[PDB]
Each structure stands twice: as C-alpha cells, then as structure tokens.
Amino acid sequence: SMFLPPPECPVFEPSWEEFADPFAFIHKIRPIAEQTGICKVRPPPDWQPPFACDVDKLHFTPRIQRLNELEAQTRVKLRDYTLRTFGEMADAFKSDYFNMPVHMVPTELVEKEFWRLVSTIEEDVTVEYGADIASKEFGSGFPVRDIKLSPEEEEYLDSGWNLNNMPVMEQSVLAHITADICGMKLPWLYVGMCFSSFCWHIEDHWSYSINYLHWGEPKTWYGVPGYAAEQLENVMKKLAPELFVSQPDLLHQLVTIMNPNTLMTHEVPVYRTNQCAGEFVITFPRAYHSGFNQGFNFAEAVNFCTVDWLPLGRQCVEHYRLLHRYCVFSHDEMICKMASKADVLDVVVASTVQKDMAIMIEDEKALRETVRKLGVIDSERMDFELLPDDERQCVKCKTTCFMSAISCSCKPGLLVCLHHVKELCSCPPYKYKLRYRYTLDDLYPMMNALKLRAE
Ligand SMILES: O=C(O)CNC(=O)C(=O)O
Ligand SMILES: [Cl-]
Ligand SMILES: [Mn+2]
Numbered sequence: 486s487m488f489l490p491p492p493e494c495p496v497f498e499p500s501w502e503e504f505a506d507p508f509a510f511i512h513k514i515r516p517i518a519e520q521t522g523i524c525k526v527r528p529p530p531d532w533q534p535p536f537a538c539d540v541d542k543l544h545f546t547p548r549i550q551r552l553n554e555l556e557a558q559t560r561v562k563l564r565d566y567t568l569r570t571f572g573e574m575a576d577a578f579k580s581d582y583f584n585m586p587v588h589m590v591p592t593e594l595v596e597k598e599f600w601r602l603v604s605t606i607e608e609d610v611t612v613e614y615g616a617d618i619a620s621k622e623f624g625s626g627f628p629v630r631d632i633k634l635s636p637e638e639e640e641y642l643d644s645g646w647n648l649n650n651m652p653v654m655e656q657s658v659l660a661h662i663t664a665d666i667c668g669m670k671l672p673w674l675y676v677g678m679c680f681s682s683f684c685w686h687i688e689d690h691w692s693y694s695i696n697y698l699h700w701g702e703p704k705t706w707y708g709v710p711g712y713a714a715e716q717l718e719n720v721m722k723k724l725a726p727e728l729f730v731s732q733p734d735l736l737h738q739l740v741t742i743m744n745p746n747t748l749m750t751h752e753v754p755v756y757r758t759n760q761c762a763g764e765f766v767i768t769f770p771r772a773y774h775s776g777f778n779q780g781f782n783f784a785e786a787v788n789f790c791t792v793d794w795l796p797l798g799r800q801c802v803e804h805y806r807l808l809h810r811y812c813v814f815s816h817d818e819m820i821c822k823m824a825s826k827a828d829v830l831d832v833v834v835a836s837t838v839q840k841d842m843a844i845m846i847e848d849e850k851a852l853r854e855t856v857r858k859l860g861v862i863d864s865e866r867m868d869f870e871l872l873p874d875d876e877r878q879c880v881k882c883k884t885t886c887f888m889s890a891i892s893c894s895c896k897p898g899l900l901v902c903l904h905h906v907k908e909l910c911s912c913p914p915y916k917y918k919l920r921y922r923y924t925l926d927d928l929y930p931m932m933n934a935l936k937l938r939a940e
C-alpha cells in the first residue's frame with residue numbers, strides 16, 4: 486500500500502556472439518529498451534573482469550547527503566575515507582539501522598524503508614557517498630595500461646565493455662571530439678552505502694549512459710522512457726517549482742528525490758530493477774532515472790553517443806536554447822570536426838553525420854538570410870573553436886557558438902547567436918558584424934566528402 490514497486494525493466498542475457506560488440510548489441514535492443522528508458526544486461530558467465538584493489542591505499546573525499554523527498558540537491562560535477570574505513574562505516578550503518586547482519590536484509594524491505602524515511606519529515610538521516618573521475622588516488626576498476634598486468638587482466642584491456650574503452654571506440658561520436666569534455670567522456674566512479682542515492686536526472690546532451698557494478702550490494706534503479714521526459718518534468722514542476730528557476734551555470738543544476746508512485750499516479754510510465762554485481766545498466770537518450778544503493782558497493786559509469794543519438798543531440802541543443810541552459814560542448818563543432826576527418830570515419834558513421842550536416846547547413850542558410858534582412862552587412866571569418874567556451878556563449882540563451890554569431894563594436898567581447906540578434910546592444914544594425922566559421926561554399930564540399938566516404 487505505502488509503496489507499489491514499478492514493473493521490472495527488460496533484462497538481457499546476450500550470448501558470446503551477441504556480447505562481443507556492445508554498439509551492435511545496443512542498437513539491437515534499442516526498440517525494446519527505449520520504451521522503458523533503462524535496461525539491464527547480464528554478461529555471459531565466462532565474462533568476468535578481475536577486480537583487484539588495495540582497500541587501504543585508495544582514499545577519496547566523501548560527499549554528504551540528506552534524504553528528503555522534493556528537497557533540492559546540487560548535481561555532482563567537475564576527512565578522507567580509505568575504501569576500508571568507508572566500508573566499515575557503511576556496514577556498521579546498515580547493520581545498526583536494521584539490527585541485522587547486513588546481508589540478511591531483503592532488498593524489497595530496504596526499498597520500502599527508503600521511501601518511508603525520505604518522505605517522513607521527522608527522520609533526519611544523512612549518508613555519505615563517493616563520486617569522482619578516476620585519479621591517481623582512486624583509479625578505474627577496469628584494467629588499464631600502465632605496473633605489470635596478469636594474463637587475465639590483459640583479456641579485458643581491449644574489451645568493448647571495458648568502460649574506459651567505450652568512449653573512444655570509434656562508434657561513439659564523442660571519441661573524435663578534441664574540445665575538453667573530461668567530465669563527459671571519462672568514466673565516473675561511485676562508492677555507495679545503504680540509502681545513498683542519485684536524484685532524478687537525464688544525461689548531458691541526452692547521451693546514453695552505461696553503468697557497471699563491479700562489486701557489492703545491489704543498486705536499485707528507477708527509469709522513465711525518453712518519450713515521457715516532458716510528462717515527468719511537468720509532474721515535478723508542479724510539486725517542486727524551486728528546481729526549475731534559471732541556473733547561474735552548469736555547476737548549479739538542481740535535482741531531487743521523488744517517489745515513483747507519485748509519477749505513476751500521474752500516468753508517467755516508470756520501471757525498476759536491482760542491479761547486482763557484474764551486471765550492466767544502460768540508460769537511453771533523455772530517459773530520466775534515479776535510485777539508491779542497498780549497501781556498500783562500487784560502480785563505474787560513463788556517457789556515450791551512438792549514431793542513433795545524433796538527431797537527438799541536435800534537438801537537445803535546441804531545447805537547451807529554449808531553456809537558456811549552458812551546453813557542455815558545441816554540437817556543430819563536433820559535426821564539422823568529423824566532417825574534416827571524413828576519410829578515416831566509419832562508413833555508417835559518415836552516412837549519419839552527413840544527414841545531420843545537411844540539416845545544419847539548411848538551418849544556417851536560413852538564419853544568415855534572416856540576419857542580413859535585419860541590417861547586418863559586415864562580416865568576418867572567426868575560428869570559434871579557439872575561444873574558451875565562456876567567451877563564446879550567447880548573451881541571451883547561453884548557447885555555445887560555432888557556426889556563427891553577431892558581434893558589435895559598441896559591446897566588445899559580447900556575442901549572440903543568430904536567433905537573438907536584437908539582444909546584443911542598442912546600436913543600429915550596420916555596427917554589427919556576422920562572425921562565421923564557414924562560408925556556405927566551404928560547407929557543401931565538407932558534406933560531399935562524407936557522402937563519398939559513405940558511398
Ligand atoms: O550510480 C550512480 O550513483 C548514478 N549513475 C548514473 O546516474 C548513471 O550511471 O547514469
Ligand atoms: Cl526525511
Ligand atoms: Mn545518470
């Protein structure tokens with residue numbers, strides 16, 4: 486009555502033939518899983534990456550977490566615990582909370598107890614957790630090249646499901662990006678304890694996310710399919726409007742804990758799963774997800790973008806602009822970078838990039854005609870990729886400029902995208918300059934190179 490568990494998400498058990506290539510597999514399970522938002526992947530029994538670490542030499546600074554529903558939390562972005570001392574803290578917490586041996590507590594009990602304690606205004610439970618990019622003080626759980634590796638570790642060095650390799654595997658379009666997006670293309674490490682949770686969110690630029698539980702007690706997930714993303718946001722906007730005020734920057738995104746039953750009440754489809762050790766969880770583009778840890782564990786997650794994502798990546802940047810939210814990178818700069826590397830691209834990748842570039846060129850053509858009719862006559866080429874991102878964001882909608890922007894001598898250093906020409910300054914239009922990366926005559930050959938590559 487208190488908590489009705491959402492239905493279970495799809496669970497996939499691929500064979501070795503299927504499991505070999507992750508990108509082919511994901512593209513194969515996409516019709517099913519994009520209807521549920523999240524899905525679980527059980528690797529073949531023989532696939533078992535070795536986990537070896539010294540629990541005494543791995544430290545990390547813990548993050549503190551209050552467990553209150555609808556309360557605002559800042560999203561994690563870019564004394565200490567050793568992994569042993571944290572684990573002793575975590576196990577003692579759960580053991581004392583339930584007065585039971587940590588592993589005799591049912592996962593469904595912890596679930597209903599989590600949703601009890603977060604709604605109860607009386608309870609003041611705070612927990613700690615670890616969340617960070619791999620460093621010298623705390624490295625990846627997967628094998629990496631560096632030290633002498635055992636023959637079994639060498640098996641999994643070049644694996645596709647080694648989340649260190651997934652970003653740069655040449656089917657992830659995030660691989661050829663040279664701009665700094667370290668918080669996006671590098672794996673995150675999550676050290677969890679009982680009730681430690683991650684609030685409702687989607688990935689930056691609506692990218693995929695893949696999560697591997699190396700070891701420990703399960704991680705409980707809740708997922709919402711991408712098509713219901715705005716349904717969920719409406720439900721949340723009503724209950725918690727505090728989360729939807731304009732963010733000063735990217736380090737100030739507000740997220741929250743909210744009961745799935747509340748979403749299911751408003752006809753938002755929600756799915757759940759328990760991710761156990763050695764299992765993958767995959768979230769699809771714009772699929773909202775949240776959850777909590779059943780106890781002491783260690784997870785590793787990374788974002789990635791396939792060819793299927795490219796159109797969504799464009800729609801997302803459009804949506805970011807409507808909301809005046811900062812981008813992590815320029816979508817167009819990425820597209821043009823791949824166009825300039827057409828000869829070395831995968832041919833299916835080149836085909837998809839071409840289609841997106843065709844749309845980009847069509848839009849840019851229309852926008853430049855529009856600003857010309859606004860009086861902007863003067864123009865000059867400008868290498869936007871050389872500018873730090875904070876120096877090339879639209880004054881109005883905060884979008885990162887690459888294809889074009891408008892500048893004015895009256896307001897030096899300031900820029901606006903071509904959607905917000907009126908927002909630059911109070912000077913007449915002939916004082917404006919169109920700053921462009923490419924002429925339309927530069928762009929069509931670039932697209933042609935993609936077409937030839939894709940045959
Ligand atoms: O494991 C966590 O704490 C949170 N993980 C994610 O949000 C993800 O893998 O996409
Ligand atoms: Cl509470
Ligand atoms: Mn996530």
Ligand SMILES: [Mn+2]
Nearest residue numbers: 806807881882
């Ligand atoms: Mn506007």
Ligand SMILES: [Zn+2]
Nearest residue numbers: 879882902905
């Ligand atoms: Zn703008």
